[PDB]
């Protein structure tokens, strides 16, 4: 692992404070490049944050706020790009970390030498020292040097001086390795970055943050793209043109853009583009296409793009908080939803101004054809009359290309449900699953969550559900027939896999091949009904397939090859029964 997405909770409180820190651990453990915002908030004093050791680059902003922890270890963070900015102004925001006393004492951002866009906002940090000391202007990129800088220096403690090692008295802390290294105001000539005051110390044009040498392979960071160790302005195109005829030919060295990287293939759960990019949404004249292997590409609609079902946070539903009776009809007939679904308490309170009744449990059956959600599924309210989430029985994938609060692809909280019932769900493409405070919910332990996940940054965070010891104690375990003890709820229609046979969607021990009515045949472990014109057999099988010509023997008459109830009575046909049961044509024309 080197790349991980960020979050998008800003200053909102975690709904499950008991599982917030393991959420951050699962996200950032081993991560080196945060492709989003690094948000560290509401962390207690004794919080172990070692899993942040390896972060070198943040593509969005860094938000460090409302913490009691005395130190966040980001000594290796080299560059903040600021493609997004907190409050639309700041690549780095350190706020309200305080109130031995708690609160951040030192920033210790000893490798932070580049902010491409955005400013610095440091406010209300009573225990913080040395922030007034950094030459922030050396850190900003030349194209970002009127970036705002709002730095509160009010403290509740005295600071030791910087180490005598720091000769500019510029430091991130009191240690000798906390001195600020200047990479831009020091440089000879007009170089953007250097390793020293001579012009041989200057860094290649394609470097950001600094360099260990003058080549475009000695950068500490790439200003545009990391092409297998070489910092470059763009990736090699996927097609090159014959210099004489300008016919397209596929470039063997071509790459896709992916963040600030050039890569051979788009990573799992991303879309490839004809333009040569890896995205999470298609271009506008485009549609998604899935290949043999599971790969999904964004290929241009050869004609007008056919209609698609959009979810919340998408197109006309972009600003819509929740599914309500006002918009439930929008999902009628949908197999695949481009966007997300959120069920909030307000989902089940109607709008009496327009005499619109609240969302009724029967309307939710609109989702019973739903097989894929490209975004997330968030459920924080559900009708108490509904035992489970079975109107989502047919949901196969939650891709999680959009995550709630930037982290969770599946959230269930505060519900009355007694089991899940997502019997078809077999992949959470990305993101975490958070299941908490569902007092009556059993059958959480019974789900094989590891087979749903696709990357190791994923896990199930769960708390304050029904204790499994009561579930076991009341006999709410998987059905005997559920293979490996994996199931989504009670009974024989909730197994993930079936140890014997399947009739419809119920697991059964045997099919009615020899005993029972209607007699059946088996195909791929499925019980399927013989044609009703097959005569049932005592001591043998009754049919070899579904059709009337696959009977062992006919129950009434035979119109060869078919077992028929009666002889029928383009050529107009008139037939009568032979004494052996066969249908012959009539000879009268």
């Amino acid at each position, epitope marked *: 692992t080197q790349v991980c997405t960020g979050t998008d909770m800003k200053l909102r409180l975690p709904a499950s404070p008991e599982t917030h820190l393991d959420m951050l651990r699962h996200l950032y453990q081993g991560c080196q490049v945060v492709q989003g915002n690094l948000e560290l908030t509401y962390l207690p004093t004794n919080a172990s944050l070692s899993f942040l050791q390896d972060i070198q680059e943040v593509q969005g902003y860094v938000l460090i706020a409302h913490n009691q922890v005395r130190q966040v270890p980001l000594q290796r963070l080299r560059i903040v790009r600021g493609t997004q900015l907190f409050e639309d102004n700041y690549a780095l925001a350190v706020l309200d970390n305080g109130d031995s006393p708690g609160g951040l004492r030192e920033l210790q951002l000893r490798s932070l030498t580049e902010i491409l866009k955005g400013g610095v906002l440091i406010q209300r940090n009573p225990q913080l020292c040395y922030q007034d000391t950094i030459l922030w202007k050396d850190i900003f990129h030349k194209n970002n040097q009127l970036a705002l800088t709002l730095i509160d220096t009010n403290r509740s403690r005295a600071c030791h001086p910087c180490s005598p090692m720091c000769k500019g008295s510029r430091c991130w802390g009191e240690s000798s390795e906390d001195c600020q290294s200047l990479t831009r105001t020091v440089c000879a000539g007009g170089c953007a970055r250097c390793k020293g005051p001579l012009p041989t110390d200057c860094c290649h044009e394609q470097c950001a943050a600094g360099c260990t040498g003058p080549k475009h392979s000695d950068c500490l960071a790439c200003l545009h793209f990391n092409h297998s160790g070489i910092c470059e302005l763009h990736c090699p195109a996927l097609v090159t043109y014959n210099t004489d005829t300008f016919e397209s030919m596929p470039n063997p060295e071509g790459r896709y853009t992916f963040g600030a990287s050039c890569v051979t293939a788009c990573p799992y759960n991303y879309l490839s583009t004809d333009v040569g990019s890896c995205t999470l949404v298609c271009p506008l004249h485009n549609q998604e296409v899935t290949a043999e292997d599971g790969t999904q590409r964004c290929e241009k609609c050869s004609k007008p793009c056919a209609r698609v079902c959009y979810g919340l946070g998408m197109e006309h539903l972009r600003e819509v908080r929740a599914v309500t009776s006002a918009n439930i009809q929008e999902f009628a007939g949908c197999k695949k939803i481009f966007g997300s679904l959120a069920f909030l308490p307000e989902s089940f309170d109607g709008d009496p101004a327009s005499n619109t009744a609240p969302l009724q449990p029967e309307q939710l059956q609109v989702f019973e054809t739903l097989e894929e959600i490209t975004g997330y599924l968030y459920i924080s309210a559900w009708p108490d009359s509904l035992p489970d989430l079975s109107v989502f029985q047919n949901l196969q994938v939650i891709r999680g290309r959009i995550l709630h609060n930037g982290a969770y692809s599946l959230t269930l909280q505060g519900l009355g449900i007694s089991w899940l019932g997502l019997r078809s769900l077999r992949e959470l493409g990305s993101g975490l699953a958070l299941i908490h405070h569902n007092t009556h919910l059993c059958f959480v332990h019974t789900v094989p969550w590891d087979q749903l996940f696709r990357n190791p940054h994923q896990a199930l965070l769960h708390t304050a559900n029904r204790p499994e010891d009561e579930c076991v104690g009341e006999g709410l375990a998987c059905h005997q027939l559920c293979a490996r003890g994996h199931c989504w709820g009670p009974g024989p229609t909730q197994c993930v896999n079936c140890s014997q046979f399947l009739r419809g969607q119920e697991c059964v021990e045997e099919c009615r091949v020899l005993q029972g009515l209607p007699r059946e045949y088996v195909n791929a472990r499925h019980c399927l009904p013989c044609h009703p014109e097959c005569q049932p057999q005592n001591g043998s099988v009754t049919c070899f397939g579904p*059709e009337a*010509d696959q009977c062992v023997a006919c129950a009434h008459y035979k119109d*060869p090859p078919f077992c028929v109830a009666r*002889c029928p009575s*383009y*050529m107009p046909i008139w037939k009568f029964p*032979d004494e052996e049961g066969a*249908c012959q*044509p009539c*000879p009268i024309n």
Partner: antibody
Framework: EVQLVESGGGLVQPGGSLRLSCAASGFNIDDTYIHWVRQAPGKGLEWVARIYPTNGYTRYADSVKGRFTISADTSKNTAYLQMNSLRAEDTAVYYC?????????????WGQGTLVTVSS | DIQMTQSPSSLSASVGDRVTITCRASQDVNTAVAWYQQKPGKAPKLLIYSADFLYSGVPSRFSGSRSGTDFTLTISSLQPEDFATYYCQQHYTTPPTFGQGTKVEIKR
């Protein structure tokens, strides 16, 4: 007036795929069964596959099971033979024929055949 | 799986002569037998369905008869246009199976 027109044959490399199409006209394929019968050059008729488009039930000959798949589009009133993993022995004129009706299980109408040639 | 064995594989008869083609089933196939005519490079054409019924539009010099598992196509007055390969077929069971065919050449 009943008619069946096949298309999609031609040359294909051994191992390669091909898909023939039978455009039915003057009748609905949902009312009867549709067959593919083929004839290698200078040889006899070989029944190959059958489909009941009402419900898509299919049946195949031993010589083609696991490689050929017959299907139907009732909206386009067409049937299709998808031939994968082809061999030189499969080289033949492929005919599409129908069964006459509900109680008429002789092949009354035939298209005039598309020749599939399997060669490097 | 029921086989249809056709005999002879080829015959030569003169114009106006009575020609008998024989086709024997490996089991009881009842009357589910059809006879087709095929001229070179052409689609086969239905001549007789249900063993002994003449299909509409076909000349009456074509008859079919049945004797147990033995099925006989007869052309009572061979005409030059009757040069073709003739095939028998069973549809008593699935799969339907064709005979090997009989080539009829006119001797003049």
């Amino acid at each position: 007036e009943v008619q069946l027109v096949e298309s999609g044959g031609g040359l294909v490399q051994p191992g390669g795929s091909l898909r023939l199409s039978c455009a039915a006209s003057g009748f609905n394929i949902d009312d009867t069964y549709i067959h593919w019968v083929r004839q290698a050059p200078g040889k006899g008729l070989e029944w190959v596959a059958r489909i009941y488009p009402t419900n898509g039930y299919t049946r195949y000959a031993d010589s083609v099971k696991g490689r050929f798949t017959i299907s139907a589009d009732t909206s386009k009133n067409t049937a299709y033979l998808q031939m994968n993993s082809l061999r030189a022995e499969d080289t033949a004129v492929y005919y599409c024929s129908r069964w006459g009706g509900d109680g008429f299980y002789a092949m009354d109408y035939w298209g005039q055949g598309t020749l599939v040639t399997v060669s490097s | 799986d029921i086989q249809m064995t056709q005999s002879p594989s080829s015959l030569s008869a003169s114009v106006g002569d009575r020609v008998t083609i024989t086709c024997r089933a490996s089991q009881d196939v009842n009357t589910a037998v059809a006879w087709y005519q095929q001229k070179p490079g052409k689609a086969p054409k239905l001549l007789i369905y249900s063993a002994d019924f003449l299909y509409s539009g076909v000349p009456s010099r074509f008859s079919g008869s049945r004797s147990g598992t033995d099925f006989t196509l007869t052309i009572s007055s061979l005409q030059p246009e009757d040069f073709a390969t003739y095939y028998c077929q069973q549809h008593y069971t699935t799969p339907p199976t064709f005979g090997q065919g009989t080539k009829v050449e006119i001797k003049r």
